[PDB]
Structures are given as structure tokens and as C-alpha cells.
Enzyme design. Structure first.
Site, PDB file in Angstrom:
ATOM      1  N   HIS A 107       0.807  -1.211   0.000  1.00  0.00           N
ATOM      2  CA  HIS A 107       0.000   0.000   0.000  1.00  0.00           C
ATOM      3  C   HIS A 107       0.848   1.273   0.000  1.00  0.00           C
ATOM      4  O   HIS A 107       0.333   2.360  -0.228  1.00  0.00           O
ATOM      5  CB  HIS A 107      -1.076  -0.029   1.104  1.00  0.00           C
ATOM      6  CG  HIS A 107      -0.643   0.531   2.429  1.00  0.00           C
ATOM      7  ND1 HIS A 107      -0.299  -0.268   3.504  1.00  0.00           N
ATOM      8  CD2 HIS A 107      -0.607   1.800   2.884  1.00  0.00           C
ATOM      9  CE1 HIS A 107      -0.072   0.487   4.557  1.00  0.00           C
ATOM     10  NE2 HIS A 107      -0.255   1.755   4.212  1.00  0.00           N
ATOM     11  N   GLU A 148      18.997   7.276   8.880  1.00  0.00           N
ATOM     12  CA  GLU A 148      18.263   8.401   9.433  1.00  0.00           C
ATOM     13  C   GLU A 148      17.885   8.300  10.901  1.00  0.00           C
ATOM     14  O   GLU A 148      17.632   7.212  11.422  1.00  0.00           O
ATOM     15  CB  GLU A 148      16.936   8.584   8.662  1.00  0.00           C
ATOM     16  CG  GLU A 148      17.055   9.129   7.247  1.00  0.00           C
ATOM     17  CD  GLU A 148      17.326  10.617   7.218  1.00  0.00           C
ATOM     18  OE1 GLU A 148      17.857  11.134   8.214  1.00  0.00           O
ATOM     19  OE2 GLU A 148      17.001  11.280   6.209  1.00  0.00           O
ATOM     20  N   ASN A 164      16.957  11.920  12.708  1.00  0.00           N
ATOM     21  CA  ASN A 164      16.095  13.086  12.539  1.00  0.00           C
ATOM     22  C   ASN A 164      15.885  13.191  11.025  1.00  0.00           C
ATOM     23  O   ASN A 164      16.846  13.462  10.291  1.00  0.00           O
ATOM     24  CB  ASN A 164      16.773  14.359  13.062  1.00  0.00           C
ATOM     25  CG  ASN A 164      15.849  15.579  13.011  1.00  0.00           C
ATOM     26  OD1 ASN A 164      15.006  15.700  12.126  1.00  0.00           O
ATOM     27  ND2 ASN A 164      16.050  16.515  13.935  1.00  0.00           N
ATOM     28  N   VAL A 219      16.783  16.880   9.604  1.00  0.00           N
ATOM     29  CA  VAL A 219      18.088  17.472   9.856  1.00  0.00           C
ATOM     30  C   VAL A 219      19.171  16.512   9.354  1.00  0.00           C
ATOM     31  O   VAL A 219      19.109  15.303   9.627  1.00  0.00           O
ATOM     32  CB  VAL A 219      18.288  17.732  11.362  1.00  0.00           C
ATOM     33  CG1 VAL A 219      19.709  18.161  11.640  1.00  0.00           C
ATOM     34  CG2 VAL A 219      17.320  18.794  11.847  1.00  0.00           C
ATOM     35  N   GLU A 234      23.367   9.692   6.796  1.00  0.00           N
ATOM     36  CA  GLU A 234      22.376   9.421   5.767  1.00  0.00           C
ATOM     37  C   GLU A 234      22.939   8.907   4.461  1.00  0.00           C
ATOM     38  O   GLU A 234      24.023   9.309   4.035  1.00  0.00           O
ATOM     39  CB  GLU A 234      21.576  10.688   5.440  1.00  0.00           C
ATOM     40  CG  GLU A 234      20.772  11.265   6.589  1.00  0.00           C
ATOM     41  CD  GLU A 234      21.554  12.248   7.442  1.00  0.00           C
ATOM     42  OE1 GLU A 234      22.792  12.337   7.333  1.00  0.00           O
ATOM     43  OE2 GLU A 234      20.918  12.949   8.240  1.00  0.00           O
ATOM     44  N   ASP A 275      -0.150  -7.490   1.947  1.00  0.00           N
ATOM     45  CA  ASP A 275       0.374  -6.129   1.950  1.00  0.00           C
ATOM     46  C   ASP A 275       1.887  -6.159   2.126  1.00  0.00           C
ATOM     47  O   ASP A 275       2.413  -5.872   3.201  1.00  0.00           O
ATOM     48  CB  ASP A 275      -0.295  -5.316   3.061  1.00  0.00           C
ATOM     49  CG  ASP A 275      -0.057  -3.817   2.929  1.00  0.00           C
ATOM     50  OD1 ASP A 275       0.466  -3.359   1.891  1.00  0.00           O
ATOM     51  OD2 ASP A 275      -0.409  -3.084   3.870  1.00  0.00           O
ATOM     52  N   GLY A 315       1.903   6.604   8.524  1.00  0.00           N
ATOM     53  CA  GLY A 315       3.273   7.065   8.362  1.00  0.00           C
ATOM     54  C   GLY A 315       4.265   5.998   8.794  1.00  0.00           C
ATOM     55  O   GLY A 315       5.445   6.048   8.417  1.00  0.00           O
ATOM     56  N   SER A 333       3.472   2.857   8.309  1.00  0.00           N
ATOM     57  CA  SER A 333       3.194   1.816   7.316  1.00  0.00           C
ATOM     58  C   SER A 333       4.419   1.382   6.526  1.00  0.00           C
ATOM     59  O   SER A 333       5.225   2.215   6.113  1.00  0.00           O
ATOM     60  CB  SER A 333       2.096   2.274   6.361  1.00  0.00           C
ATOM     61  OG  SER A 333       0.851   2.316   7.036  1.00  0.00           O
ATOM     62  N   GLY A 334       4.555   0.074   6.341  1.00  0.00           N
ATOM     63  CA  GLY A 334       5.684  -0.474   5.607  1.00  0.00           C
ATOM     64  C   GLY A 334       6.900  -0.735   6.482  1.00  0.00           C
ATOM     65  O   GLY A 334       7.815  -1.446   6.070  1.00  0.00           O
TER      66      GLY A 334
HETATM   67 CA   LIG Z   1      18.696  13.199   9.020  1.00  0.00          CA
END
Ligand SMILES: [Ca+2]
Length: 223
Positions: free
Chosen positions: A40, A52, A54, A57, A62, A84, A175, A177-178
Site C-alpha cells: 500500500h 536516518e 532526525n 536534519v 544518511e 500487503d 506514516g 506503514s511499511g
Molecule cells: Ca537526518
């Protein structure tokens, strides 16, 4: 994640953020070039953000890599969310390190009562919406199907498992989800759906990853 706690920075190295100009779903790194998420969460183009903490920021760990192939389970049912699950092949392999690492697939279907870790940058409120900057964590157990449906306003299929608390207060939410549900070092669930968020008698519903180990492996080998 409603009622959770802020994860220690990069303590959930397999957690990724799916971004299309903003964070919209989570995912789990299973090998240096593949991420497993929920069907979905499909979009025509997706940028995978690893390392990640934050999400708003730049902290220095990252790795942003575009999705090359976005493969939803062929039997995904958008109405019921049955099957799903989705696989994303990254355009290039990521550099694996302490903060960007893979999580193992299940060796078996974990039993009710197993303690797990759910994580994500989803909504932190049971009413209204609040998107957190920092990755949220929640310690929660797999629940028996009968317990889950006892006073809930929904039922689940064999490709789903309830995880959380019958009393409410703590749960995944939009949010998330997954994203992952990892128990004893194995990815047992994927955040899928629920009735509201953190409501009493309505635990979250997750894709039962143990039912898809073969599909995952076959798909990865075929691509
Ligand atoms: Ca970050």
C-alpha cells in the site's frame, strides 16, 4: 508510533524512510540492495533514506538512494490489505556499516507472546496528527488472533498478525506503514493497517512476513 519512545540514534540500523518529497512510509533493509515494505506504500517513484534519525536534519549518517524496481506482491488486495508486502530494489547497493545494516528474514512464524520492536516516523497521536522529527520505537508483543478480534471492530486474514496492546495507548499509526516489527533479530511483521491508532480493543494489524520468505527470495533472485 503512538505512546512509544525516541529510539537511540541509529539504534535501528535496518529502518529506512520512503520519501517522495516528504516521508510517507517506512521499510526494512534486508540486503545491501533490497528493502521490504508494504504494497500500500507503492508510488511511481520512491527515494529510500537510510541511516536516518532526525528526518528533517542532516546529521551525517544518511544514504539516499532511489528505488530502481518497486514490486508489490502480485496478490495484494487494496480493499482488505491482504498480501500487503512489497520489495524495492535500490538503484545501487548501499554501504553497510554500524548505522546502516540488514535485518534477517524469519526462520519460522513467531508465537503469540513474542516480544518485538516496532519503529517509524509515523503519527504519534491517537487523535489528530503529529509527525515526529526523530525515529520512534515501541516494545510490543505479538498477540493471539482470538484476543485481537474479541472486542475489535475488525478481523484479520492468515497473512496478518496483531501486535500491540489490547488496552490501547501504544500502537503504530499512519506514516509507520511499511515499517518493521522485529523480534529476536528477525523481521516478523510489516506495519499495515488498523482501526484508528492506539485505541482500546483495537491492536495494530501487520503483514505476517513468515508467510512470504519464499516469495521474497524468489523475487530477489529473479531480479
Ligand atoms: Ca537526518
Amino acid at each position: 508510533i503512538v505512546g512509544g519512545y525516541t529510539c537511540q540514534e541509529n539504534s535501528v540500523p535496518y529502518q529506512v524512510s520512503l520519501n517522495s518529497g516528504y516521508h510517507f512510509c517506512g521499510g526494512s533493509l534486508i540486503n545491501d540492495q533490497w528493502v521490504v515494505s508494504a504494497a500500500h506504500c507503492y508510488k511511481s517513484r520512491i527515494q529510500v533514506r537510510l541511516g536516518e534519525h532526525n528526518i528533517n536534519v542532516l546529521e551525517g549518517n544518511e544514504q539516499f538512494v532511489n528505488a530502481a524496481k518497486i514490486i508489490k506482491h502480485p496478490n495484494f488486495d487494496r480493499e482488505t490489505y491482504n498480501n500487503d508486502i512489497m520489495l524495492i530494489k535500490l538503484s545501487s547497493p548501499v554501504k553497510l556499516n554500524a548505522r546502516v545494516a540488514t535485518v534477517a528474514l524469519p526462520s519460522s512464524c513467531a508465537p503469540a507472546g513474542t516480544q518485538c520492536l516496532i519503529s517509524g516516523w509515523g503519527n504519534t497521536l491517537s487523535s489528530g496528527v503529529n509527525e515526529p522529527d526523530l525515529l520512534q520505537c515501541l516494545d510490543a508483543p505479538l498477540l493471539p488472533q482470538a484476543d485481537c478480534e474479541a472486542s475489535s471492530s475488525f478481523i484479520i486474514t492468515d497473512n496478518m498478525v496483531c501486535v500491540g496492546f489490547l488496552e490501547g495507548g501504544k500502537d503504530a499509526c499512519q506514516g509507520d506503514s511499511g515499517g518493521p516489527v522485529v523480534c529476536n533479530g528477525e523481521l516478523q511483521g510489516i506495519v499495515s493497517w488498523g482501526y484508528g491508532c492506539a485505541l482500546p480493543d483495537n491492536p495494530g494489524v501487520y503483514t505476517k512476513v513468515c508467510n512470504y520468505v519464499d516469495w521474497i527470495q524468489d523475487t530477489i533472485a529473479a531480479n
